[PDB]
């Protein structure tokens, strides 16, 4: 469980992210696809993209980037009380998209990388540690629902 001080660090840097949700979303998905190519194969919608240039030029990729960060932001603002927002996400990613928990670890790493690159002043080590804990909490609760369904 995160303390109030840790949640405040997480939400302070997230407020900066909301100033440009589309730019952050695109950077995060591209970072994920370049670092872990097997994740791109899960998206029939984006598997035709081969180079980083093509990825940056895709408006549809940018759109999905917004969807991912808007959903994640709603969860973080609940400060742990995210049952209602996390349940539908877990169901779709386990049974429809078939996304292993390991790929959620990969995207958490991309998020931390991008936040460090765009906000060095508000994302020091203390904030990095808090963000890492918030994403672990996110994964732990997703994994419990995956286990229930048999994934
Ligand atoms: C921070 C993590 C993530 C969040 C918040 C997130 C959020 C979402 C949301 C809101 C949708 C649309 C509604 C739904 O289907 O539930 C979606 C769709 C999808 N997600 Fe995720 N997602 C995340 C991670 C991943 C990862 C790591 C992968 C796989 C490498 C993945 C693959 C998909 C796919 C395949 C779809 C369908 C895209 C389409 O419309 O064709 N997601 N995700
Ligand atoms: N829900």
The first and second tokens of residue 126, run together, are 């203390």
> Over 46-72, what HEC string results?
CCCCCCHHHHHHCHHHHHHHHHHHHHH
Question: Residue 2 contacts by C-beta under 8 Å, 6 or more apart in sequence?
Answer: 10, 79, 80, 130, 133, 134, 137
Rounded-to-10 torsion of CA 42, 61, 132, 91: -50
For residue 116, the CA-to-ligand 1 centroid distance in Å is: 23
The Cα–Cα gap between 150 and 28 comes to 29
The Cα–Cα gap between 102 and 106 comes to 6
Neighbour tally for 135: CB within 10 Å: 20
Say yes or no: domain 1-151 is CATH 1.10.490.10. Answer: yes
Q: Where are the domains of the chain?
A: 1-151
The first and second tokens of residue 84, run together, are 């209602």
Task: Give me the helices (H) in 77-124, please.
Answer: 83-95, 101-118
Rounded-to-10 torsion of CA 93, 98, 104, 106: -150
Instruction: Give the residue, out of 68, 95, 139, with the most ligand 1 atoms within 8 A of its beta carbon, to mutate for a pocket test.
Output: 68
Question: Residue 55 contacts by C-beta under 8 Å, 6 or more apart in sequence?
Answer: 26, 29, 30, 33, 46, 49, 61
The Cα–Cα gap between 126 and 80 comes to 19
Residue with CA closest to ligand 2 atom 1: 84
């Amino acid at each position: 469980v995160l303390s109030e001080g840790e949640w405040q660090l997480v939400l302070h840097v997230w407020a900066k992210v909301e100033a440009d949700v589309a730019g952050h979303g695109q950077d995060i998905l591209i970072r994920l696809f370049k670092s872990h190519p097997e994740t791109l194969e899960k998206f029939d919608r984006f598997k035709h993209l081969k180079t980083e240039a093509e990825m940056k030029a895709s408006e549809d990729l940018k759109k999905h980037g917004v969807t991912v960060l808007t959903a994640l932001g709603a969860i973080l603002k609940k400060k742990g009380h995210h049952e209602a927002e996390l349940k539908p996400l877990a169901q779709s990613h386990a049974t429809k998209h078939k996304i292993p928990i390991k790929y959620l670890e990969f995207i958490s790493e991309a998020i931390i990388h991008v936040l460090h690159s765009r906000h060095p002043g508000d994302f020091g080590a203390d904030a990095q540690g808090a963000m890492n804990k918030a994403l672990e909490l996110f994964r732990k609760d997703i994994a419990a629902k995956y286990k229930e369904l048999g994934y």
